[PDB]
Enzyme design. Structure first.
Site, mmCIF file in Angstrom:
data_model
loop_
_atom_site.group_PDB
_atom_site.id
_atom_site.type_symbol
_atom_site.label_atom_id
_atom_site.label_comp_id
_atom_site.label_asym_id
_atom_site.label_seq_id
_atom_site.Cartn_x
_atom_site.Cartn_y
_atom_site.Cartn_z
ATOM 1 N N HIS A 187 22.559 32.641 39.427
ATOM 2 C CA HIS A 187 22.912 33.483 40.565
ATOM 3 C C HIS A 187 21.717 34.265 41.043
ATOM 4 O O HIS A 187 21.146 35.063 40.286
ATOM 5 C CB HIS A 187 24.023 34.445 40.186
ATOM 6 C CG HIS A 187 25.330 33.765 39.974
ATOM 7 N ND1 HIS A 187 26.375 34.335 39.281
ATOM 8 C CD2 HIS A 187 25.739 32.520 40.319
ATOM 9 C CE1 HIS A 187 27.386 33.488 39.242
ATOM 10 N NE2 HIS A 187 27.029 32.382 39.868
ATOM 11 N N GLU A 237 30.532 29.429 36.228
ATOM 12 C CA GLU A 237 31.663 30.185 36.744
ATOM 13 C C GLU A 237 32.431 29.383 37.809
ATOM 14 O O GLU A 237 33.636 29.141 37.683
ATOM 15 C CB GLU A 237 31.129 31.495 37.303
ATOM 16 C CG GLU A 237 30.422 32.311 36.199
ATOM 17 C CD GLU A 237 30.461 33.795 36.456
ATOM 18 O OE1 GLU A 237 29.863 34.214 37.457
ATOM 19 O OE2 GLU A 237 31.106 34.535 35.680
ATOM 20 N N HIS A 240 20.102 35.975 37.594
ATOM 21 C CA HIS A 240 20.573 35.888 36.231
ATOM 22 C C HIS A 240 21.373 34.616 36.105
ATOM 23 O O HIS A 240 21.618 33.918 37.112
ATOM 24 C CB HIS A 240 21.460 37.083 35.892
ATOM 25 C CG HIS A 240 22.708 37.132 36.714
ATOM 26 N ND1 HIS A 240 22.791 37.805 37.913
ATOM 27 C CD2 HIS A 240 23.910 36.534 36.531
ATOM 28 C CE1 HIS A 240 23.999 37.623 38.428
ATOM 29 N NE2 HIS A 240 24.694 36.849 37.611
ATOM 30 N N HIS A 281 25.393 41.863 29.151
ATOM 31 C CA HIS A 281 26.237 40.749 29.603
ATOM 32 C C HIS A 281 25.476 39.557 30.180
ATOM 33 O O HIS A 281 26.047 38.479 30.308
ATOM 34 C CB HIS A 281 27.307 41.201 30.597
ATOM 35 C CG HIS A 281 26.790 41.985 31.755
ATOM 36 N ND1 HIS A 281 26.473 41.402 32.966
ATOM 37 C CD2 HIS A 281 26.598 43.317 31.915
ATOM 38 C CE1 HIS A 281 26.071 42.340 33.807
ATOM 39 N NE2 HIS A 281 26.149 43.510 33.198
ATOM 40 N N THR A 297 31.449 38.527 40.139
ATOM 41 C CA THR A 297 32.211 37.906 39.058
ATOM 42 C C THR A 297 32.167 38.717 37.779
ATOM 43 O O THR A 297 32.751 38.314 36.764
ATOM 44 C CB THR A 297 31.665 36.541 38.723
ATOM 45 O OG1 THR A 297 30.318 36.701 38.297
ATOM 46 C CG2 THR A 297 31.723 35.621 39.944
ATOM 47 N N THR A 298 31.532 39.875 37.848
ATOM 48 C CA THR A 298 31.524 40.844 36.764
ATOM 49 C C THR A 298 32.038 42.162 37.293
ATOM 50 O O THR A 298 31.864 42.477 38.466
ATOM 51 C CB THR A 298 30.109 41.074 36.181
ATOM 52 O OG1 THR A 298 29.157 41.302 37.236
ATOM 53 C CG2 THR A 298 29.699 39.887 35.328
HETATM 54 ZN ZN ZN Z 1 26.411 36.083 38.151
#
Ligand code: ZN
Length: 257
Positions: A116, A103, A91, A61, A195-196
Site C-alpha cells: 500500500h 487484504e 507498507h 502492526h 483497512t486498519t
Molecule cells: Zn495497508
C-alpha cells in the site's frame, strides 16, 4: 488495544471503531467479471522521480517507509482522482504462509502480500486533516506473489533486522519506490476505507491488476518481524491483513477491458 490476534483482531474492531460496519469499508473482493470498464477514467500518473524517503518504522502492526510530504515530490494524480495526492508512506500486509496475506482478493484469490502506497489530497494540507475527508486519501495497492526476487524491494528487506520490534525506527534515505511497481498500470478503483483502525472512509482505492513477484526469501524476512516491543513476549508479525468486507452499494470500476 486492536491487533490481529484471537482476542483483538478484525472481528473485534467494531467495538472501538463502529465504522467497521460502515457502508464503504475496505478491503473487498474484486470480482473481475462484475467490474465495469469506465471510459471517463483519465490515465494514471505516478510521479515518483523526486521522492524523498526518510525513515522506516515498525509501528506494531506493519512497517512504514516514510517520505517527505512537505512538497509535491512524489505524487499520484489522474485515473479517478481529482487533484494531486502526495505520498506519505508505504507498507505491506502479509501472511504466515504464501497462500494468504493480501487484504483485497481477486475472484476470491488471496496473494502472498499486498503493498500500500498511501497518498493524501494536497487540498487538505496534511494527512491528519485529509483522513477526515471522503476524498482525503488515495492508496495504490499492489499484489505480491512469490516467484522471482524483486530487486527493488531488497533494500527494504535488508534493513528489517534493525526494526525488529514495535517502536524501532531507522534512517532510510534515497529509496526509490519506482522499483516496486509492475510494468502495467492497469487498475481497478472503488471508494473505501483505511483497512486498519480508525477505519475511516476516506480512501479512493486504486488496485493494480498486475502483481509484482518477490522471492520466498524476501517474504520470509517480513515474517521475522515482531508485533511486540523489545522485552515483551515475542509474537511474529504475520497475518496482519483484514479480510474482505461487504461491497454494499458500490461498483468497482476498471481502467481496462
Ligand atoms: Zn495497508
Amino acid at each position: 488495544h486492536w491487533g490481529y490476534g484471537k482476542h483483538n483482531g478484525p472481528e473485534h474492531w467494531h467495538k472501538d471503531f463502529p465504522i467497521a460496519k460502515g457502508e464503504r469499508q475496505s478491503p473487498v473482493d474484486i470480482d473481475t467479471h462484475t467490474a465495469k470498464y469506465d471510459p471517463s477514467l483519465k490515465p494514471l500518473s505516478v510521479s515518483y522521480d523526486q521522492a524523498t524517503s526518510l525513515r522506516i518504522l515498525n509501528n506494531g502492526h506493519a512497517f512504514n517507509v516514510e517520505f517527505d510530504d512537505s512538497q509535491d515530490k512524489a505524487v499520484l494524480k489522474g485515473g479517478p482522482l481529482d487533484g494531486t495526492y502526495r505520498l506519505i508512506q508505504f507498507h505491506f500486509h502479509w501472511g504466515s504462509l504464501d497462500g494468504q496475506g493480501s487484504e483485497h482478493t481477486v475472484d476470491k484469490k488471496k496473494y502472498a502480500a499486498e503493498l500500500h502506497l498511501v497518498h493524501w489530497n494536497t487540498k487538505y494540507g496534511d494527512f491528519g486533516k485529509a483522513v477526515q475527508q471522503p476524498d482525503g486519501l488515495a492508496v495504490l495497492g499492489i499484489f505480491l506473489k512469490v516467484g522471482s526476487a524483486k530487486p527493488g524491494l531488497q533494500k527494504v528487506v535488508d534493513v528489517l533486522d534493525s526494526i525488529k520490534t514495535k517502536g524501532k525506527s531507522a534512517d532510510f534515505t534515497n529509496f526509490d519506490p519506482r522499483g516496486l511497481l509492475p510494468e502495467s498500470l492497469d487498475y481497478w478503483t472503488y471508494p473505501g476505507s483505511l483497512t486498519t483502525p480508525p477505519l475511516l472512509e476516506c480512501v479512493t482505492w486504486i488496485v493494480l491488476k498486475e502483481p509484482i513477484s518477490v522471492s520466498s526469501e524476501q517474504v520470509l524476512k517480513f515474517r521475522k518481524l515482531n508485533f511486540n516491543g523489545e522485552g515483551e513476549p515475542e509474537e511474529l508479525m504475520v497475518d496482519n491483513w483484514r479480510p474482505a468486507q461487504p461491497l454494499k452499494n458500490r461498483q468497482i470500476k476498471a481502467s481496462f477491458k
